[PDB]
Design an enzyme around this catalytic site. Sequence first.
Site, PDB file in Angstrom:
ATOM      1  N   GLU A  35       0.811  -1.212   0.000  1.00 15.02           N
ATOM      2  CA  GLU A  35       0.000   0.000   0.000  1.00 15.02           C
ATOM      3  C   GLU A  35       0.853   1.275   0.000  1.00 15.02           C
ATOM      4  O   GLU A  35       0.581   2.196  -0.749  1.00 15.02           O
ATOM      5  CB  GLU A  35      -0.972   0.012   1.181  1.00 15.02           C
ATOM      6  CG  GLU A  35      -2.116  -0.965   1.037  1.00 15.02           C
ATOM      7  CD  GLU A  35      -3.150  -0.508   0.030  1.00 15.02           C
ATOM      8  OE1 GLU A  35      -3.026   0.624  -0.477  1.00 15.02           O
ATOM      9  OE2 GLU A  35      -4.091  -1.277  -0.260  1.00 15.02           O
ATOM     10  N   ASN A  46      -7.222   9.357  -6.080  1.00 12.06           N
ATOM     11  CA  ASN A  46      -8.026   8.444  -6.870  1.00 12.06           C
ATOM     12  C   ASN A  46      -8.824   9.222  -7.904  1.00 12.06           C
ATOM     13  O   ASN A  46      -9.056  10.423  -7.742  1.00 12.06           O
ATOM     14  CB  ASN A  46      -8.947   7.614  -5.973  1.00 12.06           C
ATOM     15  CG  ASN A  46      -8.199   6.940  -4.832  1.00 12.06           C
ATOM     16  OD1 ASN A  46      -8.409   7.259  -3.661  1.00 12.06           O
ATOM     17  ND2 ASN A  46      -7.326   6.006  -5.168  1.00 12.06           N
ATOM     18  N   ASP A  48     -11.866   9.360  -8.650  1.00  8.51           N
ATOM     19  CA  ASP A  48     -13.117   9.961  -8.191  1.00  8.51           C
ATOM     20  C   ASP A  48     -12.917  11.233  -7.345  1.00  8.51           C
ATOM     21  O   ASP A  48     -13.884  11.838  -6.882  1.00  8.51           O
ATOM     22  CB  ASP A  48     -14.000   8.931  -7.460  1.00  8.51           C
ATOM     23  CG  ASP A  48     -13.448   8.535  -6.097  1.00  8.51           C
ATOM     24  OD1 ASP A  48     -12.513   9.193  -5.611  1.00  8.51           O
ATOM     25  OD2 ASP A  48     -13.958   7.564  -5.504  1.00  8.51           O
ATOM     26  N   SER A  50     -11.169  11.346  -4.453  1.00  8.78           N
ATOM     27  CA  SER A  50     -10.764  11.015  -3.090  1.00  8.78           C
ATOM     28  C   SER A  50      -9.257  10.766  -3.026  1.00  8.78           C
ATOM     29  O   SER A  50      -8.594  10.646  -4.059  1.00  8.78           O
ATOM     30  CB  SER A  50     -11.538   9.811  -2.553  1.00  8.78           C
ATOM     31  OG  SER A  50     -11.299   8.654  -3.327  1.00  8.78           O
ATOM     32  N   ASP A  52      -5.932   8.672  -0.834  1.00  3.37           N
ATOM     33  CA  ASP A  52      -5.483   7.644   0.101  1.00  3.37           C
ATOM     34  C   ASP A  52      -4.342   8.176   0.966  1.00  3.37           C
ATOM     35  O   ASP A  52      -3.408   8.805   0.462  1.00  3.37           O
ATOM     36  CB  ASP A  52      -4.984   6.411  -0.649  1.00  3.37           C
ATOM     37  CG  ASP A  52      -6.075   5.709  -1.435  1.00  3.37           C
ATOM     38  OD1 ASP A  52      -7.265   6.024  -1.231  1.00  3.37           O
ATOM     39  OD2 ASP A  52      -5.730   4.826  -2.252  1.00  3.37           O
ATOM     40  N   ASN A  59      -8.675   5.865   2.852  1.00  4.00           N
ATOM     41  CA  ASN A  59      -9.293   6.686   1.812  1.00  4.00           C
ATOM     42  C   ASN A  59     -10.248   7.742   2.358  1.00  4.00           C
ATOM     43  O   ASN A  59     -11.072   7.462   3.218  1.00  4.00           O
ATOM     44  CB  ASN A  59     -10.004   5.769   0.801  1.00  4.00           C
ATOM     45  CG  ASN A  59     -10.646   6.530  -0.351  1.00  4.00           C
ATOM     46  OD1 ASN A  59     -11.858   6.475  -0.536  1.00  4.00           O
ATOM     47  ND2 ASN A  59      -9.835   7.232  -1.135  1.00  4.00           N
TER      48      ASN A  59
HETATM   49 CL   LIG Z   1      -9.492   2.541   2.806  1.00  5.37          CL
END
Ligand SMILES: [Cl-]
EC number: 3.2.1.17
Length: 129
Positions: A35, A46, A48, A50, A52, A59
Amino acid sequence: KVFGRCELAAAMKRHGLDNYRGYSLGNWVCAAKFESNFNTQATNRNTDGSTDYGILQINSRWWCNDGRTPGSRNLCNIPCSALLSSDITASVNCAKKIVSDGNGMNAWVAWRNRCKGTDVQAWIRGCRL
Ligand SMILES: [Cl-]
Ligand SMILES: [Cl-]
Ligand SMILES: [Cl-]
Ligand SMILES: [Cl-]
Ligand SMILES: [Cl-]
Ligand SMILES: [Cl-]
Ligand code: NA
């Protein structure tokens, strides 16, 4: 802060992640690995809108507030920046919440694709725990 492998295992364990909701330490460390590369300051945007955050790439769509994800929730009740700290407490607590959500560690796409069903214990092998 870029954690070493065994250092992160130790920290995760001290915060009660080890076997949390039935997932052994090896899962969480493996997850962190793919990750964020063990980097508390990792971020990824991301498509959309959002973002991380942190060692577990939590997120902003559901879990934290970054003030720039229209329509999102803040179920962990923290600013996403707290997820970037050299101290993993916030990331750990928020991860305990996510992994209880109903879908276990599948919530982390990298865990599902890269850790799930692998020899996860390799990730904590040789670590003084
Ligand atoms: Cl998450
Ligand atoms: Cl660094
Ligand atoms: Cl280490
Ligand atoms: Cl393990
Ligand atoms: Cl927002
Ligand atoms: Cl589960
Ligand atoms: Na949010």
